[PDB]
């Protein structure tokens, strides 16, 4: 159950979250702060793509007789130019923004992984599949303190060192 392996489907509370395993209990959880930042950011981006557009009262359809052929050709040319520029700009813009959205989400995952790794530098063995297996045994307050960001090294340092010596 790691991020390199795939994506979880049980949790829907946030885009980003932790899975905790304990003797007392086992379940999923979600990082409200990280997800809230990201949801706000994506909302702002979508609003800017749709809102910055401001339409005015324009008439597109024009009528010209047989004598005014140059005017009809000019109107066709300017309409074709506008639609071609709009198509090219919109398609390249949406492709680039999709790539930014995926890149930003991956960067959020890597930032969360590096944060929890910097907090658990050597107290927990790293599986490499996205799982941090604790050497030291600690209950649910320990894991939610890891979620809280208030985990401390010296409290479980000696037990972790003994568990390294055992393995």
């Amino acid at each position, epitope marked *: 159950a790691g991020f390199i392996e795939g994506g979880w489907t049980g949790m829907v*509370d946030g885009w980003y979250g932790y899975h905790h395993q304990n003797e007392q209990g086992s*379940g999923y959880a979600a990082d*409200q702060k990280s997800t809230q930042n990201a949801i706000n950011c994506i909302t702002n981006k979508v609003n800017s793509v749709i809102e910055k557009m401001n339409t005015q009262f324009t008439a597109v359809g024009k009528e010209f007789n047989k004598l005014e052929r140059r005017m009809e050709n000019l109107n066709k040319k300017v309409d074709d130019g506008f639609i071609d520029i709009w198509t090219y700009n919109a398609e390249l813009l949406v492709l680039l923004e999709n790539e930014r959205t995926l890149d930003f989400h991956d960067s959020n995952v890597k930032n969360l992984y590096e944060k929890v790794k910097s907090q658990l530098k050597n107290n927990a063995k790293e599986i490499g599949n996205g799982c941090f297996e604790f050497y030291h045994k600690c209950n649910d307050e320990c894991m939610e303190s890891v979620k809280n960001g208030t985990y401390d090294y010296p409290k479980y340092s000696e037990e972790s060192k003994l568990n390294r010596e055992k393995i």
Partner: antibody
Amino acid sequence: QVQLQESGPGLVKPSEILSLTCAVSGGSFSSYCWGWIRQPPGKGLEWIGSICGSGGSNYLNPSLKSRVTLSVDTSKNQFSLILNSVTAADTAVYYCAREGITIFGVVIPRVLDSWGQGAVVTVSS
Amino acid sequence: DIQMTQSPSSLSASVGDTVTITCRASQSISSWLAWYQQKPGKAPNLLIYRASTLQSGVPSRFSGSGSGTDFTLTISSLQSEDFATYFCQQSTSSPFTFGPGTKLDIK
């Protein structure tokens, strides 16, 4: 629109298991979290705890963490509250509600829309 | 954790008036807020989510805005059904505490 119906004992002695069962009609335990809200008489609302999915995500209040345990069973289609060591301060109107609102595919945390009509319970002699 | 305050505590207004209710928060909650109105003895219902948007099935007379530590809810025309109490809720972290509540009354 989902319909929420809750059943309660209506009376509870001090210091035993207090259990209420909330049933939902027209909805399932899929992609929507479910939570419990209680209000004391004449005081404001507060959040006891929330379950989401089918037993996957469990959230509890820090003050009531040891006291409340949330259990679900989709086959019978109810979610229930289990409370031990009940006190006189627990006299409240229990509300069960659905975390039905969502933005960009996430279920916003703890923003409730449709609740139940309420089941009153008092702790007394 | 994130303490919630409301102002004014009690307000009275007539039918058709404009009333602004300002719930205030101890620490920045960004744009995340829930507004609930509670009829006496009935289930509270959702009014405003994200402090700027309207949930469907709510009349469009209600409007909310604000950012930072200060937020406002503005009602354009206040009818008889809107005289119930109102609540302010934050949704960024546990515990998800609620506002003390603001009561509305005729004159």
